[PDB]
């Protein structure tokens, strides 16, 4: 039940579907917010990057983040804030040779994968406004129903 690929766009998915983004370059992979209590932007860092300050345009704001990647695999840094006044901190990191980043709205929370392939695992983030969270996606993506999360886990950890 893997549908796609779909080209980069902005939308608000329904609950109960994994969005699986096939990142093909460094920089911002997606940006997601409800404009109240939830902002997440994922930043892709290519292998073998010494600590360095990099600039990224997220939510129309130029931000500087100090990044690194000591591993041969790509790193996907979740940058989160809970308020517009709050600084974007690296809340989770997905280290992956599969370049598959996932997001699901389910059960009043946002679910994403983090850890290191092929052992990456899901994690939840709370919000008081799940429905209002939209997403801007900068690479091609797929959709798969939550009922097939075992398959989604397989794709995140072992590839398409």
Numbering used by the authors: 3 to 162
What does the paper say about this structure?
Rotaviruses are the leading etiologic agent of viral gastroenteritis in infants and young children worldwide and are responsible for an estimated 140,000 deaths each year in developing countries. Diverse interactions between histo-blood group antigens (HBGAs) and rotavirus have been described and it is believed that HBGAs expressed on the surface of target cells serve as viral receptors. The distal VP8* portion (~27 kDa, N-terminal) of the rotavirus spike protein VP4 from P, P, P and P genotypes recognize the secretor HBGAs. To understand the molecular basis of LNB and H1 recognition and binding to P VP8* we determined the crystal structure of the clinical isolate Pc VP8* in its apo form and bound to LNB and H1 glycans.
Two different crystalline forms of Pc VP8* in its apo form were obtained. The first form, VP8*-Apo1, diffracts at 1.35 Å resolution and presents a single copy of Pc VP8* in the crystal asymmetric unit (ASU) while the second form, VP8*-Apo2, diffracts to 1.5 Å and presents two copies in the ASU. The three copies of Pc VP8* in these two crystalline forms present the galectin fold with two twisted β-sheets separated by a superficial cleft that conforms the glycan binding site in P and P genotypes. Superimposition of the individual VP8* protomers from these crystals showed that the three molecules of Pc VP8* are almost identical (RMSD 0.28 Å for the superposition of all the Cα). Furthermore, Pc VP8* are also structurally identical (RMSDs 0.37–0.57 Å) to the VP8* apo forms of the linage I PWa and PRotarix, supporting that the glycan binding site is preformed in the Pc VP8* protein.
